[PDB]
Design an enzyme around this catalytic site. Structure first.
Site, PDB file in Angstrom:
ATOM      1  N   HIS A 181      40.985  36.425  30.502  1.00 43.13           N
ATOM      2  CA  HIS A 181      42.340  37.016  30.306  1.00 43.13           C
ATOM      3  C   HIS A 181      42.281  38.367  29.566  1.00 43.13           C
ATOM      4  O   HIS A 181      43.325  39.053  29.487  1.00 43.13           O
ATOM      5  CB  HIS A 181      43.263  36.018  29.649  1.00 43.13           C
ATOM      6  CG  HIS A 181      42.998  35.735  28.218  1.00 43.13           C
ATOM      7  ND1 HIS A 181      42.429  34.541  27.830  1.00 43.13           N
ATOM      8  CD2 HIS A 181      43.351  36.384  27.087  1.00 43.13           C
ATOM      9  CE1 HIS A 181      42.394  34.509  26.497  1.00 43.13           C
ATOM     10  NE2 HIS A 181      42.915  35.632  26.031  1.00 43.13           N
ATOM     11  N   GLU A 227      37.286  30.661  32.624  1.00 44.07           N
ATOM     12  CA  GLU A 227      37.844  31.545  31.568  1.00 44.07           C
ATOM     13  C   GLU A 227      36.766  32.339  30.841  1.00 44.07           C
ATOM     14  O   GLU A 227      37.114  32.952  29.817  1.00 44.07           O
ATOM     15  CB  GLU A 227      38.737  30.728  30.633  1.00 44.07           C
ATOM     16  CG  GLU A 227      39.727  31.552  29.814  1.00 44.07           C
ATOM     17  CD  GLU A 227      40.676  32.448  30.609  1.00 44.07           C
ATOM     18  OE1 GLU A 227      40.883  32.195  31.813  1.00 44.07           O
ATOM     19  OE2 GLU A 227      41.101  33.497  30.046  1.00 44.07           O
ATOM     20  N   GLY A 267      45.038  36.585  18.201  1.00 43.97           N
ATOM     21  CA  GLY A 267      44.016  37.375  17.499  1.00 43.97           C
ATOM     22  C   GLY A 267      42.670  36.654  17.394  1.00 43.97           C
ATOM     23  O   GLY A 267      41.715  37.342  17.026  1.00 43.97           O
ATOM     24  N   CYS A 313      41.237  34.912  20.049  1.00 44.93           N
ATOM     25  CA  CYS A 313      40.576  34.794  21.377  1.00 44.93           C
ATOM     26  C   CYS A 313      39.264  35.566  21.354  1.00 44.93           C
ATOM     27  O   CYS A 313      39.175  36.728  20.837  1.00 44.93           O
ATOM     28  CB  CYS A 313      41.484  35.147  22.548  1.00 44.93           C
ATOM     29  SG  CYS A 313      42.757  33.862  22.736  1.00 44.93           S
TER      30      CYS A 313
END
Length: 182
Positions: A41, A72, A146, A148
């Site tokens: 992402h 991911e 914040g 990730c």
């Protein structure tokens, strides 16, 4: 404060950079040579900022399992003038549960942040932001925006990177040794 934090700090001090894309600042784990990982992402493009330096992306691959399900993890090769310490020998070979993990973050907003998240479950399937996702680890800590890209470790193992949460639980994508065979 203890041997868990010792291993986490050793990883953060040599194997992380601050990565900036159009979607924000992320903790980014360097694995070996000029190869690093980031949550998919982050939407890595042709150019990324690494410690506030404009850097060409030589390759970016959004990983999916052999069911064609999102994992991911994006593997990025950076046009950087310096190699990472090779930490592939700290990656797990198989999907597993863990005790007593630490989530470690380093950004402009959250420098030198370490969180004892406790027991880590092999959760498996997660609908992450509407996207079916496999190989998810779960910890019962109220993680936030914040974190990730934060690195999940136990003593001696680098087991995942933080990719989301629900307000009560945090979720990480597994790192497996087989993702980084050259």
């Amino acid at each position: 404060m203890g041997p868990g934090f010792d291993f986490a700090q050793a990883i953060m001090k040599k194997n992380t950079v601050i990565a900036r894309t159009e979607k924000g600042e992320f903790t980014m784990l360097g694995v070996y040579d000029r190869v690093a990982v980031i949550p998919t992402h982050a939407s890595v493009g042709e150019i990324i900022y690494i410690n506030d330096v404009e850097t060409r992306v030589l390759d970016a691959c959004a990983l999916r399992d052999l069911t064609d399900t999102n994992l991911e993890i994006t593997i990025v090769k950076l046009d950087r003038n310096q190699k990472f310490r090779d930490i592939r020998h700290f990656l797990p070979r198989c999907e597993d549960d863990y005790n007593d993990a630490v989530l470690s973050v380093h950004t402009s907003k959250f420098p030198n942040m370490y969180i004892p998240v406790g027991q880590v479950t092999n959760y498996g399937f997660l609908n992450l932001g509407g996207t079916p996702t496999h190989r998810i680890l779960m910890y019962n800590f109220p993680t936030r925006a914040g974190q990730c890209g934060g690195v999940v470790t136990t003593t001696g193992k680098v087991i995942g990177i933080h990719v989301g949460g629900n307000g009560a639980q945090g979720f990480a994508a597994m790192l497996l040794h087989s993702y980084f065979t050259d």
